[PDB]
Amino acid sequence: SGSAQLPQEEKAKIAEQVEIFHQEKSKLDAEVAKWDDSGNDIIVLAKQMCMIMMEMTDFTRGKGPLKNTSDVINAAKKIAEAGSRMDKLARAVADQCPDSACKQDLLAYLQRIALYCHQLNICSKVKAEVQNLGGELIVSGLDSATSLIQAAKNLMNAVVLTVKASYVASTKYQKVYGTAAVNSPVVSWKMK
Amino acid sequence: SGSAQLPQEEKAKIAEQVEIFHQEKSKLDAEVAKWDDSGNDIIVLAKQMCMIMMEMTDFTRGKGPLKNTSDVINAAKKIAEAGSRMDKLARAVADQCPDSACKQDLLAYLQRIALYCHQLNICSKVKAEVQNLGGELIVSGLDSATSLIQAAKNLMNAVVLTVKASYVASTKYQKVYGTAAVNSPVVSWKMK
């Protein structure tokens, strides 16, 4: 034996946070659906980050390929690696951008991505523990899954904003320097 | 919120293992009650090991001064330090012993103490965790407290045997070499 289901209250709070997460995920799907991700690794990395975040939130609902805390920790580290790669590419977009306010916006969103990848790493431990409290041995940390989902939602939101700001910064470069700029855009935005 | 009581089944299995532990602890109390522990640090260390094991088993019943897993881990490390000190002293008793079979017995019980201190260190983590199993997020490891109590019971039993074998080895030294042996017994066994 040795196992028990989460209290029904906790299962309810989880399905509630997962719904909020799914609404942020829809924003990313809508944004990414416009573009052909050939020649745009920011889109590819965003889709990969999104897919892994879906695995992590599915874990909290008893779904998907992640079975234990170790898998969830490894998923968070993969998200962080992808965010590190998106960061390097979007930094080059921002450097190429001729508008200082679009550039600053984009760089600030990248710092948000770094912070939220780190916070997702922290929450991926989904810690439970026993403690001696109130004259009983109790199991604490049962709401850790909810912190995980909210950290995923925060990261999803920053990825959405970063993808949009990368597009905006790209169009400023082309508007100013033309489609005939000698240096090609770091990333291309072609419709689907 | 965030916390829940252990399933009543688990609370029952814990009170059952604690009872078995208490019977081994009684054997130590009976053995230690005979002796004045002045001049006998094997007795002192055994009492200290016993007292800390009582704190650890009390933790599983919602009693005593240990409140969280970190306290229980620290308690196990204190037990291991005391066992290391008892080991050095009882080794000197065994070295002084003129009967090779009592000496071997005693040294073998000391290796049992080392093994059971190590196993108690492992069990003191009393690990809980969530996992994605059977289409649900469940809490596993709720029987970890039972492994902790049994590891304490194993160590208690080896301490009882070690105290007895230290006494036996001491009396062989005095029987053979007399109360006028030029080298005094490593440890003294005086009645109370």
Author numbering:
A (entry chain A), B (entry chain A): 670 to 861
Task: Copy out sentences from the published article reporting this entry, exactly as the authors wrote them.
The cadherin-catenin cell adhesion complex is the major building block of AJs, and has a crucial function in the dynamic behaviors of epithelial cells, such as cell polarization and cell rearrangements. The structure of α-catenin (100 kDa) consists of three distinct domains. The C-terminal actin-binding domain (ABD) (28 kDa), which is connected to the rest by a flexible P-linker region28 (2 kDa), directly binds to F-actin, and closely resembles the vinculin ABD (vin-ABD). The direct interaction between α-catenin and F-actin was demonstrated to be a catch bond, an interaction that is stabilized by increased force.
To assess whether the α1-helix affects the α-catenin-F-actin interaction, we performed in vitro actin cosedimentation assays with three ABD variants of αE- and αN-catenin (αE-catenin residue numbers are shown): a wild type form of ABD (ABD-WT; residues 652-906), an ABD with a structure-guided helix-1 mutation (H1) designed to unfold α1-helix (ABD-H1; RAIM670-673GSGS), and an ABD with a partially deleted α1-helix (ABD-Δα1; residues 671-906). We observed a nearly two-fold increase in the cosedimented amount of either ABD-H1 or ABD-Δα1 compared to ABD-WT. To examine the structural details of αcat-ABD with enhanced F-actin binding, we determined crystal structures of αNcat-ABD-H1. However, unlike the monomeric αNcat-ABD-WT structure, αNcat-ABD-H1 crystallized as a homodimer connected by two βH motifs. The dimer interface involves L807N of the βH, which mimics M673N of α1-helix interacting with the hydrophobic patch in the αNcat-ABD-WT structure. Moreover, the observation of αNcat-ABD-H1 dimerization, which occludes 3100 Å2 of solvent-accessible surface, in two distinct crystal forms provides a basis for further examining the physiological relevance of this ABD-dimer interface. Our NMR analysis of αNcat-ABD-H1 in solution showed that concentration-dependent chemical shift perturbations (CSPs) mostly occurred in the βH motif. In addition, we performed chemical shift (CS)-based Rosetta comparative modeling (CM)48 to show that V796N of αNcat-ABD-WT remained in the cryptic state, whereas αNcat-ABD-H1 displayed a large conformational change that exposed V796N on the surface, resembling V796 in the crystal structure of αEcat-ABD-WT. Our αNcat-ABD-H1 crystal structures revealed an unexpected ABD homodimerization, which can facilitate F-actin bundling in vitro. It involves the βH motif forming an extensive dimer interface with the hydrophobic patch uncovered by α1-helix unfolding.
